[model samples]
Target: PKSMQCKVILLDGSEYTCDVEKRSRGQVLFDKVCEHLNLLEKDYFGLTYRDAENQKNWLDPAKEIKKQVRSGAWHFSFNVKFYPPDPAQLSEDITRYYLCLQLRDDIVSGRLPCSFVTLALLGSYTVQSELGDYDPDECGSDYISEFRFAPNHTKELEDKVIELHKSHRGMTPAEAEMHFLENAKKLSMYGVDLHHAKDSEGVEIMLGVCASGLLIYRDRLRINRFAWPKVLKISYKRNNFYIKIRPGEFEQFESTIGFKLPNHRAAKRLWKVCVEHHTFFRLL
Candidate 1:
């Protein structure tokens, strides 16, 4: 079997080069990817690539690799697929750690759709895990150390944690970790694959189709969050993507907010993301 060289990408946009046999199984490439990332609980992650038709396909271990390799346009991501309804239920410490990694990524990216209270609460849990119980007399360096790790972390999160300091003043490390998983389960964006684009105004926006419903974000702030029970349907035409918000879901009798992307290609790309996400996460 002939081998080819390509670049593998990590979740944070870092890139590395590799040479793989043409008939190599999807699992083979994925194993190598996991090893490169130094990731554990390997079964929770998978590799995604686009077929020649521009449709997204998961590399099947039994099949020869085809869609993943592009003569000159090679790129790929090693991301999580398992979204456990409750992270606390997991038996191992390492499992919860991976969930923490996912939670950090989503919150930092603004992809996690949650309220200020929820974020503040999650922030405290994160702080408690990184540090122990909060102490006002504690060094400023102690508190800010973890924030240094998440560069894009929201200022609001920092403020919210401070505001909630008195309320959560004495939570032990075990208690904080427990509450973190409990609060985290309530968020709709957990382990979700996020697709982003700029709206007509050029505001960076993100969209995701999850078990909960159709979610929309304007520059990381969720503007219109649709509910699964409230959304009657989803469709698009030209560069416009629309979601039908039923009267039961509130607002108009059949109100919808129109989203205009830059071009047909961009529109279809987002549409495909929604379609794939819906089938995988929404359907019975």
Candidate 2:
């Protein structure tokens, strides 16, 4: 087989064209995708796509890429398979752009409970991407307001927005969006900062799932952690999610904790996330 040209699709439906060696491992193609997109934190992302059999697969660095993909053609989207995306590793603005898209859905769908400002400001970066800089001339522009979910968005996340607004000063709406996305990745929860929170006693709890482990944010004041080791097992039933925990290292104790989710679907989704994170982080 010989090298052939193929196209990659980003989550946004945009495409990038590149070439791949026919016998190269699937990972090689993923690396080429990093080069193609200049992704800074490529390690945190993966080149994924559906296949002829309708199975979703990430290009395994250890396998024949050509075999995993279409015989000679290729198409995929760069995505966040892991979570708690950090800005420090960002290689390009587009990484953030895609993340913001995920965050938007989390908010609009009510998966993330957040103040109006948080949601609207998050939408602003989206508007910068979907609509363009807010122009005074487009007075009463109905579509702009509708698509962004709100106009005049930003705050607390505002300081970050100020810097982004500058970078996109004269750039295209799409171009400006990269900056918005880049900064959004900096949020403690990554882009899924659904602002989802649960309160107990005097403590407020918010958390995020990642390939590594669980991150617990307390009352927006501090962060506690639950690495895979500390977690004995996770299970859920109906609308309740449970975490079986054992003390780490020198500590000695075990406990099963339970939390209520909005519904069975949410519980299962969180259960899936925990299971996926455990497998990815703790498996040999």
Candidate 3:
């Protein structure tokens, strides 16, 4: 009996040949057709369409919105953990500190990509925490490092703004500010203030600023306070100017203030613009 032979080629440039019995030619042809369809489905759609029943499980409408929101939000956080001082492993700590400083500088200088802002933030904290005798109260210590977000930060912020406009999905800028104020009051009830700190060295340093700065800047455009080596200022500049605050200075301010400051709805907004303009927070 005569037989039919077929050849198949794969993406990796591999080839295979098979022969079909005369009587089983139709079966073989059908199997090959199905196999090719399966391959096409997987390659084009990244899924197997051969099993239509199972496809419904993979395509979930309920999760679609969440996926879109998460993708569109473009907000990220990073955390870095370093070991306590160990004389035997001094080099490791020193190297980590060096990388942290480098990362911070790159972000501020626009040398590094913005997608890594979270890493840069975490790096800044690591470097600051490792510096011996680097008391948070020391005015110069906190301002020594700065971090910036690349153009992507700005893009994400703009996208978020547009999304808000389109869907009213999250808080508007004004609403965010109001919510922040309320949160501040609640924090103060627990002895936490959001706006007066110099850096995040410890709870005490943070608390002092929060108690003092929040009240001073409660209804003012700008407020200034002294903490030895440097004078701290909290000023509001219509969305654009907040980008001038450097990562190092911002962190120090938060630390001294004892609470996170709310310049805009999210820190990411300020960071993105600051990085783009290569802006730094200055000591008054």
Candidate 4:
């Protein structure tokens, strides 16, 4: 096998293209990507790709790139896998910028739904960060024409964005970015990774494990939340995943919620994701 080109779609809506040795491990390629950006907080980011089964998998650093990825498909995405509780905790603007990019994509794709007012506000901040303080001379009536803030945007939304943009004339891009994060993090789907599952009664649901806790979503809407403090244990058997919850003040006994995954591997993966998120966020 000869050296081949690897393309990583970066969070900034740009691509990073590089050549990798035929037998190089995932770590080498990841290092090169971080080096290109001069990123020091590399642990928060990861390289992910969808396999033939449409399963998203993180590239294991210890594994050879070719072995993990099917031959002839060298594309990957550099994404923020673990979101910090606070963007201010991030020491560098570049790191926070990438996080903003990820959240922007989420909103545009309609994965993170919000009110139109919230959309206009976040979109204004995005425009400010990208184009800097709005200039009447530099920005025209169609200043935000190129940006896509949501899947089904309208003229009304654009008008709101422009109006909000004018009001934020003096805020610096970094400041706008911080404000954007503060608002975006308050959204229900912020930093959530939803896994498909079915409740015990066969009701379809989406299970999300994040910084605060395990979330249950019905029709992509949050219906139940189990914070880390309320979760006693998480386990899986066969294709069933169980969440043992602590008793409420009014209840006399604890209860376990069982959900069915597509397969044993799916259940196990969900359990492992919960374990890692819990350990990192709660223990650390």
Runs off by more than 4 Å, candidate 3: 1-95, 98-223, 226-264, 267-284
Instruction: Write one digit per residue (lDDT tens) for candidate 3, span 163-203.
Output: 23333234333333232223222322222112322223322
Model 4 lDDT per residue over 7-115, tens place: 9998877999999998999999999999998888887788987777778777878899988886549899998878787888888988888788888888988878889
Instruction: Sort every candidate by lDDT, greatest first.
Output: 4, 1, 2, 3
- State each candidate's clash count: 0, 6, 15, 0
Off by over 4 Å in 1: 5-19, 23-28, 31-44, 48-75, 81-85, 89-93, 109-178, 185-207, 216-225, 229-259
Candidate 4 local accuracy as lDDT? 0.87
Q: Predictions ranked by TM-score, top down?
A: 4, 1, 2, 3
> For residues 1-284, could you state the per-residue lDDT of candidate 1 as single tens digits?
67766577665557767878776767777778877766666755567666455655455556656644444244566555556666666666655665666676667667666677777777777777666666678635324434522335566557667656546667776667677778887775675556655555656777765655677766656676776667676777898887777785345478766677656756776666566555654553
Where does candidate 4 have its weakest 10-residue lDDT segment? 136-145
Task: Give Cα-based local distance difference scores for all models.
Answer: 0.65, 0.59, 0.29, 0.87
Error of 1 at 239 (Å): 4.0
Q: Comparing 3 and 4 by lDDT, which wins?
A: 4
TM-score for candidate 2:
0.52
Q: Worst ten-residue run, lDDT, model 1?
A: 142-151
Work out the TM-score per prediction.
0.57, 0.52, 0.16, 0.89
Clashing pairs in 2: 25-65, 26-65, 40-91, 96-181, 112-194, 155-158
TM-score of 3: 0.16
